[PDB]
C-alpha cells in the first residue's frame, strides 16, 4: 500500500558460474528476483520494478515498469561473463530513481553481491553521504563467494542512514543449501 519504486541490481559476472549454491547461482539469484518482484507487486499493486546490471556495463534492460513479466523475459540469456563494476552502478541506479514518472513514490534499491568488490572506501562514503542528501534506502543483499562482511560494505550500510536512520539491512548469506528464506525473514518486510 505504501508507494515506492524498487530497483533490483543483479550481477552477471563470471563468478556466478559456480556451484556451491546448489544448481547454479544464476538460478539462485533469479529466484531471489522472483520473490522480490512478487513481494513488491502483491504488497502494493501500484508500484513498479526495473532491473540494472553491474558487471562490465550498466544496462537498463528493463525500465522501471509495473508489469513483472517483462523482467522475467529479460532474466533469460543474462550471459554471466562480465567483470564487476561497482562505483558507477549505484550512480546509474540513482539517476533512474530521479526518472520517477510518479514523483510521490519513495526510492529503494536492492543489489545482489556475488563477486568481491574492488573500490576505494572513500568513493563509497562520498556516495553514502550523497544518498544521505538524496534520501534513498539501498538494501544490500550478499550472495555468491564473498569477502564476508567487509568494512566497506558494513560502513556503507551504517553511513547510508546514521543517527537513527532506517536500518537498511546488510543481508548476509551462509554459503550452502538455502532458498531466499533468509532473504524474506527480516529484510523483505522490515528493512
Amino acid at each position: 500500500m505504501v508507494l515506492e519504486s524498487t530497483m533490483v541490481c543483479v550481477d552477471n559476472s563470471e563468478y556466478m558460474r559456480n556451484g556451491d549454491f546448489l544448481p547454479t547461482r544464476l538460478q539462485a539469484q533469479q529466484d531471489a528476483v522472483n520473490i522480490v518482484c512478487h513481494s513488491k507487486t502483491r504488497s502494493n499493486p501500484e508500484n513498479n520494478v526495473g532491473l540494472i546490471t553491474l558487471a562490465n556495463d550498466c544496462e537498463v534492460l528493463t525500465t522501471l515498469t509495473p508489469d513483472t513479466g517483462r523482467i522475467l523475459s529479460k532474466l533469460h540469456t543474462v550471459q554471466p561473463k562480465g567483470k564487476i563494476t561497482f562505483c558507477t552502478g549505484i550512480r546509474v541506479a540513482h539517476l533512474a530513481l530521479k526518472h520517477r514518472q510518479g514523483k510521490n513514490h519513495k526510492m529503494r534499491i536492492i543489489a545482489f553481491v556475488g563477486s568481491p568488490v574492488e573500490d576505494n572506501e572513500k568513493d563509497l562514503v562520498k556516495l553514502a553521504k550523497r544518498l544521505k542528501k538524496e534520501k534513498v534506502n539501498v538494501d544490500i543483499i550478499n550472495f555468491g563467494e564473498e569477502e564476508v562482511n567487509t568494512e566497506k560494505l558494513t560502513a556503507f550500510v551504517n553511513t547510508l542512514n546514521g543517527k537513527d536512520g532506517t536500518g537498511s539491512h546488510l543481508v548476509t548469506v551462509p554459503p550452502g543449501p538455502s532458498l531466499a528464506d533468509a532473504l524474506i525473514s527480516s529484510p523483505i518486510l522490515a528493512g
Binding site: 537498463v60 558507477t88 533512474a96
Partner: protein, 126 residues
C-alpha cells in the same frame, strides 16, 4: 559503408523546437533524440525524428539514460501511422560531442546495425 546522408528539412527544425522545449530549464546543453530515416541505397535518406528523455553527468562521465521503453512504444506508434518509416540512427546537439557517444552508439546498434549519428548546430548557424 554509407555513401552520404540526406537531410529532409523537417528533422533539424524538429530538433530546434525540442531544444527550445527544455530550453527554459536547459542547463544540460545537450539533447539526444532518435533519427528516423528511409534506407534507400548506399546513399541514406532522413525523413523524420523524435526525442527521448536523456540525462548525463560529467561526474564519472558514464552515467546516463536512453529510455528503451520510451524508444519501443513511441517508435511503434510512428510505425503504426506510417509503415514506410523506420529507425536509422540518432542525433544530439551542443556542437562539441562528449565522451559518452561511444556508449549510446554501441548500445543502439542492436536496433539498426549500420546506425549513424548526426550532430546539428542549433546555436552556430553562421
Amino acid at each position: 559503408a554509407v555513401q552520404k546522408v540526406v537531410v529532409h528539412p523537417l528533422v533539424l527544425l524538429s530538433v530546434v523546437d525540442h531544444f527550445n522545449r527544455i530550453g527554459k530549464v536547459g542547463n544540460q546543453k545537450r539533447v539526444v533524440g532518435v533519427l528516423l530515416g528511409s534506407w534507400q541505397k548506399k546513399v541514406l535518406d532522413v525523413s523524420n525524428s523524435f526525442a527521448v528523455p536523456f540525462d548525463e553527468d560529467d561526474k564519472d562521465d558514464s552515467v546516463w539514460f536512453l529510455d528503451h521503453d520510451y524508444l519501443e512504444n513511441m517508435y511503434g506508434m510512428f510505425k503504426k501511422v506510417n509503415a514506410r518509416e523506420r529507425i536509422v540512427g540518432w542525433y544530439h546537439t551542443g556542437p562539441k560531442l562528449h565522451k559518452n557517444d561511444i556508449a549510446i552508439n554501441e548500445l543502439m546498434k542492436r536496433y539498426c546495425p549500420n546506425s549513424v549519428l548526426v550532430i546539428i548546430d542549433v546555436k552556430p548557424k553562421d
